[model samples]
Target: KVYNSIFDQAYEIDPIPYFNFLRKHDPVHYEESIDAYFVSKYKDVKYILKNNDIFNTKTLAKRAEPVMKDRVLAQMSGQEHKSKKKAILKGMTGKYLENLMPILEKRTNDIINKHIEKKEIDIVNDFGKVFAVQSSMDLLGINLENYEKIREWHNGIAKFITSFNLNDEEIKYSLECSDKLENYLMPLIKDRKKSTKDDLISILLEYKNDENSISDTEILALSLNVLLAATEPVDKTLAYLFYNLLKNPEQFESVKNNPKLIKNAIIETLRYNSPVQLIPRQVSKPFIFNNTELQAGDTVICMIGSANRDPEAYSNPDEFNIHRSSDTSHSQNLSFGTGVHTCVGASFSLIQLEMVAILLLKRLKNIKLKTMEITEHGIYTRGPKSMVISFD
Candidate 1:
């Protein structure tokens, strides 16, 4: 049976099944408990994202404020949002992202080598988890010496923001983690303000033209935003790419011989099983959508994974195909989202994924999953809970 609400317990593990049902029968349905309309089809999801004026990110303020302490990049609007996003893009892409290439390669290789000496590894944890957080840290010029401390806070805060449900203790700890991370970040932010470096914080401090300097609170919030946003998908996508390939050996063989297919696999996996499953927004005004009347101030959840698999958008939507023409030639994938709310680190993430995959393929010879079974976890953001792989 189709789930009544996005908060269903079953979705905590994997929501794709439910999402499939929605896209087929009810593309847009209202959740009475949450008083939000969930839109699942590619066309409707795209429309809502593109029509930002109708579906504003105002709802995120409540969701993010407890942990973020300020309006996250997503919740901002008007010129403030535009300028800050530009600074983030400037810091994360182009020359800035290019310069990190060497460091990325070196760091990725170091992680690979750590487990390369061993016969088996839980790739999701041993490699993906460490590297994902490290990449975010390196980009922000955060000290690696404090890696463990930061990651603990990162884990707690991520749970609070990304999960559909949480207990009181968990919520309490999430806030604690947020406060600690804020304390940890303010000093670094202060230093960047004094003497700007070539890092992202510096980029934020001296945005293009430097017309209006961003507040220290804004910097802290934005930095946390990127840290959480960028880190969650790395391991899941890595796991899914390898998982999908292994499931389809023909495709696996193709990628094994032709390294170029790694990029295709990445794109296909993102389209096939989006790491982040949902995007949250608020209806700014009452409007009829997909034959349903959406009221003002209602939370609207965009089902990214659902939209990606809409049969109307792509042929053989259920199968994982690296060579899917629609991947590049036709429509946009909602995994990283689109429009003004699109991920600021979209290019940064692709580079990270591409480099890591190339390294893994080169280093891990005759790689195979320890078991045919793989379990995915999460609702707001989904990924393999554990993917143990054995390799030479």
Candidate 2:
């Protein structure tokens, strides 16, 4: 029997309907076009991610290495993963975030303040993308003067990493970005080595000095790794969060009336639209699933978006519910993925979301979508391409 998928345009615009279709009738569907199995059930998706022995993250050698020049945290094991992630966390969380608190308020205000007078804004571009990318530069210690090229560099790299399909232009463009970013960061990395500062690049470069673990080339890759992984999700999710809230006025009111629900709403947004929609895993060993046989070399796509809406897992899965039962399992929400390969920057991301949401909403007297054409793109990762909003 043959199975069909939704149009690229439809899926990119809104995938909830297709996610429901797949999870309902074709939970373990296989598509010959991609030559991969699409695992959509929450139980199955978690099983594959949790059992890394059967499914590994080695696919990134082709998917991410062309741009990153090295394996990121998601593609490592043992102490290599531990030591590297420790360095990354130091820059994003704990005492670092505490020190960044003052800057956080200032920067958030700086970006939003410009749009307040405009009364109309593109949330995805003006507020969300600007804040997320600018804050990433601040955390990573990139010079603000280079913001234009830096944003362009990230967009190119993100195009390759967050892609469901590949092309020659995007691949070639990302490599150019890699070369330029490497040159720009080398001097900065050396300076940080001489005298470290309060930013991520400085922290990562100075970590585990006793062992001297990572190389300069690896450092460059890790810098890009954190840059894309951390920044892309924030910009995309912020747009999706607002799109969902504004589309459902009651949900918006619920969170607006009490800021506490903003966290839940954010979590729900992660579950509902999920910025990162697909995680690629290579089959570690041949196995049978739903009477379908797989080989060791086969690739399996854990459809996180589809899995997030599986009815067997969550009630009224299609509807956006902030108060969904999160206690279902350890990694019930696979937005940041699961198991050892889970997002190290997850805590930092949540902080960025909540802080920005609170600060932006509090400043605006009111806000609503200027156009319902707010569309999301990407299959590997997804978010509103633009969210035009009118606010006072």
Candidate 3:
């Protein structure tokens, strides 16, 4: 029930201990080899990754469900994922983001301008939700004229991805979201077919194959996937960053005075309070890991939450240091993931995060947490749902 009790106050004071140490807790864990034990140490986690022939994420994801087969980044493998990765990189480059900066800047400023005058607000649900929806829509080339409805659809569609325990109402909502997302984008797809644009959706539509451009089914699935994946983690991390900084006013002041440091602060916040945790994988072949054999088709869940805090990787692993960099020589943090399927959305996520953090740290003043309560959502992904705040 860790996921259900996120509203509880003590949830964030070293919360990983609650969920990380549990042994084979989920019903799905029954599938792993009885003799093979799970490892949480950073060194071991990397060892598992380095031995990709044994623990294949591609095979693991496909085993998760039939729908995941041949999808971008998460499931496609070897030459196929590689081909798609080339296309994805072309669209999501640092240069492309630099071009989108004006659009993002306008969007960021407009969002704050909308509610900054209120003097106090639930930044989580209000600003966080709006920023996520609008930024995702803008990147995907989906018009935001129906932004609120899109947000609801986005939320429902995302829940469908991990609906192992969904109720009837939730299932119905998810199906409805699927229908709505398809209907809304059909016209856009047709229009893009007529004349492609610089937006991500249009680019995908025009992305050619050896024989033909990507099919409508491919277009729909990828758009839905990007929409669902793009928003939540970035917004939740934003909430946690603001919450932690406000709680420690000295830290907030430091960022406020030195806006350039916001990028490093965002990275630190991601490491300190990771948004995506416990990535699920399946062992692809029979192989010896720590002298224990994991056979093909065995389920393996990587506890990235634990990896981010691995003592072998970082000094003072639990401490919230705001300036760790690639130059730090630590093992790369697992925030955006690693290996062949490293987050394609990394560029988009960083641009939006940096834009908002810079604006908030500079423009807002006297920010403070509205509660002693510190909460976390305990899903495979984890973070705060809502964080109340006020500014004097």
Candidate 4:
């Protein structure tokens, strides 16, 4: 059932049974009872996502500290979430992103063209990571000269993210990155306050309401959210996309002939091997399921990764079919998630994925995948640590 060249030592275990995480020892802020539920079925995940009240995001955020302060969208509920989603989704929608696309594509191309000349390179490490971070920085209006150091923050922060049952040191390191993001963002916030620009930062600077103003802490949280959401996972996805296609050249050609399939291919990749695997949630109120009674304060894990492959929901769920049908239904895999917190960056993630896939198919004609070694990136995200491929 392994999908690509990047293998992780940790995934050696049979993930099938364990995929339905009955319970976890991970640290959780919720004091709810063990009677809580874990649901990964396609319908179930979608249900939880759409039903924000009983199975709540804001309740979870209030219980524990999410990446963004004010808990951002994931933690917002009722009118709070509606307002936040409006502000957040504005920067990611078609109109705004159209303006941002050139910046994103230019930054992505810059990284690719630079590395294409090398005889052989660790595609995952060198280009995958570079394209994602550089593009993210450009979109978010972060300084690119700070790329390496920001990457250091991104790297350490990524590590801290997966180490969920985090030790004191790991927690400290993650917090340190948070602090750095705050300090780094302060000047930009000041600048934006004086004068706004076209970046997400500037857009957020313009965001306001009678009830709430985007505060410094909230700003830091949002900045970090955009960074963590896009940086490593997008790179990992690009890595896996290459790993999958290069190994199946015929499928690649089919896609090359019909470039429209690129978006479907990315969706298939998300379903086949999701980059962000397990999603965490907390119980907001007492609820019953499967004839079992549950209490108010409990934590749960939603196995969207497994659910994507649910037999009933997806035919040949494990197979990677680039031509698999794409419609409102086929795109239901909760990879980018669904419901209120459905990836605000869905189009962003797809655009990046599409660009990478398109360039590879159009420019290279054929991609030679040299390795199928599945190296795990981290628990927070899954991707190839070392993937080497060639084109001639």
Please tell me which predicted candidate would have the highest lDDT against the true structure: 1
Q: What is the C-alpha RMSD of each candidate to the true structure, in Å?
A: 2.1, 2.1, 4.5, 5.1
What does the lDDT read for residue 257 in candidate 2?
83
Clashes of each: 0, 0, 0, 11
Order of candidate numbers by lDDT, starting with the best: 1, 2, 3, 4
User: How many angstroms is residue 262 displaced in model 1 relative to the true structure, after the best TM-score fit?
Assistant: 1.3
lDDT of candidate 2 over 45-138, digit per residue (tens): 9889999889988887677777888767777888777777888888877778987766877888998778788888787888777777778887
Order of the predicted models by TM-score, top scorer first: 1, 2, 4, 3
Q: Flag regions of model 1 displaced more than 4 Å.
A: 1-4, 208-211, 327-330
Which residue runs of candidate 4 sit more than 4 Å off their true CA positions? Answer: 1-17, 20-37, 58-70, 326-331
Q: Tens-digit lDDT track for model 3 on 1-392?
A: 32323123453445556334432232122222232334556665666666666666763343223232225456677776777766766666655566666787888778777778886656678778888888878877877799999898877766756444567887777777778777888788889888877777877886776768777767766776677778778678888888877766777777777877777777878887888765556677775545445678775666566777866678777777776655623667878877766678786677678888777755666666785576676555676768877764
Write one digit per residue (lDDT tens) for candidate 1, span 1-392. 44466677776666767778788778887777667678899999999999999999887778688999887888788887887788888877778877887888988888877877788777688888898888888888788898888989999999988765578999999999999999999999999888888788888777644466678887888899888987878878988888888888899999989988888889989999898888988888888766778788888899999999887888778789898775223467888899888887777777789888888888888988785888877767888877888898
- Model 3 segments more than 4 A misplaced: 1-14, 18-39, 58-70, 167-169, 325-329
Q: By summed lDDT, which 10 consecutive residues of candidate 4 come out lowest?
A: 22-31
Query: What is the TM-score of candidate 3?
Result: 0.85
Clashing pairs in 2: none
Please identify which of the two predictions, 2 or 3, would achieve the higher lDDT against the true structure.
Answer: 2
Cα lDDT tens digits for candidate 4, 1-392: 22211122434233443343321221111213333345656666667677766666644454235334445557666776677667766776667788777777677667667767764546688778787788778778787888887887777666765544566777777768766766677798788778877777776777776756787667666767777777867877877787777677787777777878788778888888788876766667777555545567665556677678776677777678887765423546889887777887887778767877676565553467777676654544667768887766
lDDT against the true structure, per candidate, is 0.83, 0.81, 0.68, 0.67
lDDT of model 3, residue 47: 63
Q: Please, what is the TM-score per model?
A: 0.94, 0.94, 0.85, 0.86
